[PDB]
């Protein structure tokens, strides 16, 4: 009973999103957008039934593609550890409402999958044909992220220094950097938020998202028509459902009964940065 | 009865036009598919001969196209409307499920027959989604039903023949996932000649993203989504021949035309299925000449 007040105080702050994002794998350098996506996946959306008997998915699906050495398995392990229910496979029934991480991609479960390039390493010039999965299975994923080995002389030095500092200082002290939440506390907070309530969208946000979806569909049209080639990542109503689910998850993170326009804007920005860059 | 007679007499030639139009308001376009579904609902005529030979009176239609062209929606609508409609997915039911089997009863030691999926659906509709995922062997099993509508079973100590006069809807995806415009339809379909020949109609649906078509589809989907059933409070968690006009379901432009109600449509379909037509001599020569033209079109197929 006492922990309810603690969770309410934690979720009533104006900076819950930043604290949660920083709490997602503080050891890993960079990937703030990836950390936020992982956090909103862990919070997840809300499922809704229909009187006709039909059900709509309330879980988010993410896919990651990149060269080896981009710390993909570490994120999967951290997600499995943090999630109240978590399964890790090398490539479903026992998981109910949890998260299933799937490495080497080449029942109410959220799916987080990692995969490698067809040729082993990404080729920027070739563009498409670097993903072997068919568009039919690619459409199920709510978001797709691409990671490339951005070779910078200063970035390698910074990464080496960060790794060596993590190696050295870890026996000395194990303390939060800046207000980071403990693993058990974050686990209980996520469970409490998931159990307590689930929000719904608003009319103005719905109209804004509809207009943005129409504009994005026209843009994907024009890109495909000018390129004279079929995009391996199509845009359909499932993308709109994914954006709605991400906005609902963002509203759920604040425990508000109704979603705001800021959540929809953040969901649209994340969806753009992931899919449009990937596509 | 009086209303049916009045509608038939007033709308003489428009019936087949209206029923196809009002078949599925929730689905936009695909007039030919709606006409084919209407023809399936009406059905053909089964003819029995003095020699006892049986001629099939059912029609088989196969739909192939890109994803998200409202094919499963049509299958579900047919399942809801048809009196005896059975859905059987590709790998959900095998040949044992589709074809009646023989089981040895331990209580008495005799062998009994248990009806399959198609045996129960006599003079009905069988819907098969993901027909591509079905194995070739179930296709061979279904071939007998599609040819003569009968299943012959013989296991030592017992033999029988069961009637399987039924119509089949089939929905399948292309081998490449999306239909290839450049490649020939033979490569895209990827099916044997016998199976295609046994099918009566083949429909190919393309997700042509035309400006006006995309705008119209989006408008129809938005209008259907924003619609709410009357008599119900907003935000709550949860017979005339012509349907009452709705500003959202129909639209302001569609005020000039009305859709037929579901119950009246079902009654008219049943009455029409009762009716037994007779072919005329004038149409026979025209049909024969057009068939000869179709067969000779091999030299006139152009590109």
């Amino acid at each position: 009973p006492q922990e309810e007040e603690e969770f309410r105080r934690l979720a009533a702050l104006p900076n819950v999103y930043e604290v949660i994002s920083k709490s997602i794998a503080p050891s890993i350098f960079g990937g703030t957008d990836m950390k936020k996506a992982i956090a909103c996946l862990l919070f997840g959306g809300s499922r809704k039934r229909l009187p006709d008997g039909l059900t709509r998915r309330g879980d988010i699906n993410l896919l990651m593609l990149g060269d080896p050495g981009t710390a993909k398995s570490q994120l999967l392990k951290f997600v499995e550890k943090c999630s109240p229910i978590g399964v890790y496979t090398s490539g479903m029934v026992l998981a109910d409402g949890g998260v299933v991480c799937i490495d080497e991609f080449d029942s109410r479960c959220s799916v987080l999958a990692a995969a490698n390039s067809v040729f082993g390493r990404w080729d920027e010039t070739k563009g498409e044909d670097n993903i072997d999965f068919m568009p039919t299975i690619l459409s199920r994923f709510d978001m797709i992220f691409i990671v490339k080995d951005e070779h910078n002389e200063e970035r390698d030095v910074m990464l080496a220094k960060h790794v060596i500092t993590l190696h050295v200082s870890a026996l000395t002290q194990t303390q939060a950097v800046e207000g980071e939440i403990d693993l058990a506390k974050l686990k209980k907070f996520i469970a409490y938020c998931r159990v307590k309530c689930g929000p719904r969208l608003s009319a103005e946000a719905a109209e804004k998202l509809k207009n943005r979806y129409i504009i994005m569909r026209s843009g994907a049209r024009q890109h495909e028509r000018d390129s004279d080639r079929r995009s391996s990542i199509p845009i359909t109503v499932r993308q709109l459902e994914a954006i709605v689910r991400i906005a609902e998850a963002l509203s759920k993170m604040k425990l508000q009964p109704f979603a705001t326009e800021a959540d929809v804007e953040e969901a649209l920005r994340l969806f753009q940065v992931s899919t449009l860059d990937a596509a | 009865i009086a209303k049916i007679k009045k509608f038939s007499k007033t709308r003489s030639k428009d019936i087949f036009d209206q029923l196809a139009k009002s078949l599925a308001p929730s689905i936009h376009g695909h007039d030919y598919v709606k006409k084919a579904i209407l023809c399936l609902l009406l059905g053909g005529v089964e003819r029995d001969l003095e020699n006892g030979s049986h001629i099939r009176g059912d029609i088989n239609i196969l739909l192939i196209g890109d994803p998200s062209v409202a094919k499963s929606q049509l299958l579900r609508y047919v399942l809801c409307t048809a009196p005896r409609a059975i859905p059987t997915t590709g790998r959900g039911s095998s040949g044992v499920g589709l074809t009646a089997a023989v089981t040895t009863d331990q209580e008495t030691g005799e062998r009994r027959l248990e009806a399959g999926a198609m045996v129960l659906a006599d003079r009905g509709v069988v819907c098969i989604d993901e027909f591509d995922k079905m194995s070739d062997m179930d296709r061979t099993a279904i071939h007998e039903v599609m040819e003569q509508g009968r299943v012959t079973i013989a296991k030592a100590g017992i033999h029988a023949r069961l009637n399987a006069r039924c119509s089949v809807l089939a929905a399948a995806n292309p081998v490449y996932g999306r239909y290839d415009q450049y490649k020939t339809p033979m490569e895209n379909i990827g099916l044997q000649d016998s199976l295609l020949s046994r099918f009566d109609l083949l429909f190919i649906m393309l997700d042509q993203m035309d400006p006006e078509q995309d705008r119209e589809i989006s408008d129809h989907v938005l209008r259907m989504h924003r619609y709410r059933a009357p008599g119900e409070q907003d935000g709550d968690a949860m017979t005339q021949i012509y349907e009452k006009h709705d500003n959202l379901l129909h639209g302001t432009k569609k005020k000039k035309e009305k859709m037929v109600s579901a119950a009246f449509m079902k009654k008219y379909i049943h009455v029409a299925k009762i009716i037994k037509p007779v072919l005329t001599q004038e149409s026979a020569t025209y049909i024969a000449e057009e068939y000869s033209r179709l067969r000779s079109q091999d030299s006139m197929s152009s590109d």
Side-chain angles (χ1 to χ4, degrees), chain A residues 49-51 56 134-136 200 207 210 214 217 221 224-225 228 230-232 234 236-237, chain B residues 67-68 175-182 207 209-212 214 218 222 225-226 237-238:
Chain A
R49 279 193 171 266
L50 284 164
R56 279 176 152 72
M134 278 298 186
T136 53
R200 306 203 178 203
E207 295 300 324
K210 287 179 202 169
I214 295 154
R217 178 165 263 243
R221 179 191 181 167
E224 292 179 354
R225 293 278 69 75
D228 192 28
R230 285 196 274 268
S231 177
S232 54
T236 44
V237 189
Chain B
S68 81
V175 291
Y176 303 110
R178 285 204 269 147
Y179 190 93
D180 190 282
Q181 298 286 152
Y182 308 143
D207 183 17
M209 307 198 271
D210 188 280
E212 287 301 293
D214 299 323
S218 63
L222 285 179
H225 263 292
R226 282 176 51 217
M238 199 198 304

Side-chain angles (χ1 to χ4, degrees), chain B residues 135-143 145-146 148-187:
Chain B
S135 305
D136 303 339
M137 316 317 301
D138 307 335
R139 290 163 178 157
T140 68
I142 289 169
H143 277 164
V145 173
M146 283 193 156
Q148 299 180 294
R150 65 185 173 125
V151 166
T152 65
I153 303 168
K155 260 202 177 185
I158 188 168
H159 66 293
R161 306 183 193 178
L162 312 187
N163 298 309
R165 299 170 289 257
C166 185
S167 60
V168 186
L169 289 172
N173 284 298
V175 291
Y176 303 110
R178 285 204 269 147
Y179 190 93
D180 190 282
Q181 298 286 152
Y182 308 143
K183 293 185 171 194
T184 68
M186 313 310 280
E187 303 152 289

Side-chain angles (χ1 to χ4, degrees), chain A residues 4-55:
Chain A
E4 293 198 281
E5 287 296 273
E6 298 178 32
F7 297 148
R8 278 161 173 173
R9 170 198 61 80
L10 274 169
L13 300 170
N15 317 312
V16 192
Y17 193 37
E18 286 294 304
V19 172
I20 292 169
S21 67
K22 293 164 70 175
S23 309
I24 304 292
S27 191
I28 304 176
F29 177 89
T32 66
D33 292 295
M34 191 156 284
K35 290 165 179 172
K36 291 163 172 184
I38 276 174
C40 67
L41 169 65
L42 282 149
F43 280 95
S46 80
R47 64 181 295 100
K48 305 169 193 173
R49 279 193 171 266
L50 284 164
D52 301 343
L54 301 157
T55 74

